[PDB]
Amino acid sequence: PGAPWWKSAVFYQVYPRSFKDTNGDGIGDFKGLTEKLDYLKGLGIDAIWINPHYASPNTDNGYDISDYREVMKEYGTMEDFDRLMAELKKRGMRLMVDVVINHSSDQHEWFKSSRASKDNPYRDYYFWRDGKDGHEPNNYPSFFGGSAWEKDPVTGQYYLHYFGRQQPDLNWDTPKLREELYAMLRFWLDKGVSGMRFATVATYSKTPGFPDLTPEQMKNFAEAYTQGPNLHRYLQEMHEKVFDHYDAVTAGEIFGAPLNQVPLFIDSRRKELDMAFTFDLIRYDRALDRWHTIPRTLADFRQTIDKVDAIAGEYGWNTFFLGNHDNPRAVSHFGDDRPQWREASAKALATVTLTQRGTPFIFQGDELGMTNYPFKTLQDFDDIEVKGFFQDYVETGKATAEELLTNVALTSRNNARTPFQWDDSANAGFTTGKPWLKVNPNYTEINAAREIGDPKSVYSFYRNLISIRHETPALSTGSYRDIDPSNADVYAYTRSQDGETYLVVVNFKAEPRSFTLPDGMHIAETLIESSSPAAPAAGAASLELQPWQSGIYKVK
């Protein structure tokens, strides 16, 4: 039997707002993405995940949707969306879209009606509760600052919002609401969408009665919001009434949920989701407040990957990513973005990303080795989540503004949202106007045009790796085995399928290191290396590794 197309596919995440502008408004659009499909094809990309593209007031840049069946005005029209589809299909490429159905915008017609009165037909499309003892219904905190409950004077009741105040949560306990969501999903699937990514999929179910969070739960409220009693009931239903009738791939963003519960989401026998986005790895060095950083080693890095691989079992599947629109740049976060180590480390992380077991996602710009942004003003940090950090930590005296910005500089979501660097023209060729966010000044050295013409560039190395994975089934669907989980210098693991075994070795130190193969293992061939002066001799039992050297080898 064969493996599904998505298990051996290489995905590329486009954040349309910051990818390519074509009308000089400073905002990326659909026409921009369409003009760059050849670039993505040439890289070797099989499928594209785009961030929300629906009508939105943009208080959270598309994650506050005011009309699920209309296209965001900034990105273009429905015609532009269809053309994007058609141009993708002509290149044998597939499209995955973002599905945001934990909540909607407060400008959605459902909510405008819902808030009108207690007897409105749409009232139960959301959660409305009376205050308690002169205060909020309960002690729920919002991800984006303050209470998760917001009072509305129109009726005197509070509505629930896990995130932004302009992002009220949808009530999945209401059957009529679920049917509306299902019909909306079919609407896009009938248009030929090949994949769906479910944003904060683990929070769909709310706990009956909304009791107060215990002191312990209050600490880790992200986890507590993923413990709704009817969650998997709703996910199985959505599969039965929607995805069972189509051949699209489903990807869940499982944020807040402990690893041991992930199988419930991705076990194919359960008929829920196909693969999972987990955040144990990408947040392995983030503190509980989601803005402080905690020092970690390669040991912690690889042991997390191990635990994540183990919950796949035989019937489940993982995605793999080192960066997205919500996190700092990969080379800055996991590598060394200093000008003498940036390219080398970026190539090293590319080797990891494309030799992991699971479906790899590459975030726009990482193939160029783009870096974190050098923030210098208040404005640079402008984001709804940072506004919330101010509300919860600065205005309350828990921390000074400078303390917040010092740490957020390393963790800000805006680090990943600076305009794609196409060339070295004005604003890196992203726009002919003023970009909605400032272009990283290092675009003079870091841009696509220069990378594409250089066989030693980061882009060329990614492109080479993508070709190798596509021609080596073991590197996609093969099994995973960490050689030494306790090693903090050199990351090494094997990929095996059908008698074929491959070895991956990556030095994470900016210093020369040595690696010794397991007893009875020898190098047969060298597929690729970065920062290496010479491939090992055939039959070698060990490797001499340069600083930040990475490689892939077929072994005996």
Ligand SMILES: O=C(CO)[C@@H](O)[C@H](O)[C@H](O)CO[C@H]1O[C@H](CO)[C@@H](O)[C@H](O)[C@H]1O
């Ligand atoms: O914003 C975050 C990342 O730093 C998290 O607090 C967030 O809870 C989580 O990453 C959820 O992700 C998705 O849901 C949000 C929708 O409200 C949106 O802000 C994120 O961009 C989207 O990725």
Ligand SMILES: [Ca+2]
């Ligand atoms: Ca535009």
